[PDB]
């Protein structure tokens, strides 16, 4: 579709057949979700935000479904003010910025 | 233009007679720039994201020129690791997400 920025671009996603609302963030490199339960093993990782570094759990190749769009990439689970869909996945669904 | 997202959407802006690089961040609500001098009266404010909170100075009706277009709004100035153009100015230049 084509979403305006007059309001937080929050859409829905079905991560592993489960629904959770998240923010489309062109300002994030990766997809970070608040404490969530994904199966499989995971690698701990350090990511940085506006305030510094934080520890987040990493899951590789999880099938995400953004507005009827298939995407399979790495999801990070960790403390985050909001759920975030980063450029890592936004690219797979042909998402672009236009002004 | 049409910014693809396979790499940080960094663009050039112009504020206070200075060229600076900013990030087109649809994930931010306000616009935060690295410590700099702007004219006028400003009020304190805490803004936060992943990593924590940082105290910024808020200036209103500041004229900016995002990668080529006019846009005056609210520019917060503080200890941010990178310049960020939020959804407040992104809309003013009629910016959108299309996938």
């Amino acid at each position: 579709p084509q979403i305006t920025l007059w309001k937080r671009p929050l859409v829905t996603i079905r991560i592993g057949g489960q629904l959770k609302e998240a923010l489309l963030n062109t300002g994030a490199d990766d997809t970070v979700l608040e404490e969530m339960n994904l199966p499989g093993k995971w690698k701990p990782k350090m990511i940085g935000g506006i305030g510094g570094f934080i520890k987040v759990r990493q899951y590789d190749q999880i099938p995400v479904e953004i507005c009827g769009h298939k995407a399979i990439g790495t999801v990070l689970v960790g403390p985050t003010p909001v759920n975030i869909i980063g450029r890592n996945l936004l690219t797979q669904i042909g998402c672009t910025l236009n002004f | 233009p049409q910014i693809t997202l396979w790499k940080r959407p960094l663009v050039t802006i112009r504020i206070g007679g200075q060229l600076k690089e900013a990030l087109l961040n649809t994930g931010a609500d306000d616009t935060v720039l690295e410590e700099m001098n702007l004219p006028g009266k400003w009020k304190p404010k805490m803004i936060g994201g992943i990593g924590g909170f940082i105290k910024v100075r808020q200036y209103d009706q500041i004229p900016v020129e995002i990668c080529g277009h006019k846009a005056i709004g609210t520019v917060l100035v503080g200890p941010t690791p990178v310049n960020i153009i939020g959804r407040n100015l992104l809309t003013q230049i009629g910016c959108t997400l299309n996938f």
Partner: peptide
């Protein structure tokens, strides 16, 4: 290093 900048008031 992985950079993610969402901001909230």
């Amino acid at each position: 290093v992985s950079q993610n900048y969402p901001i909230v008031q």
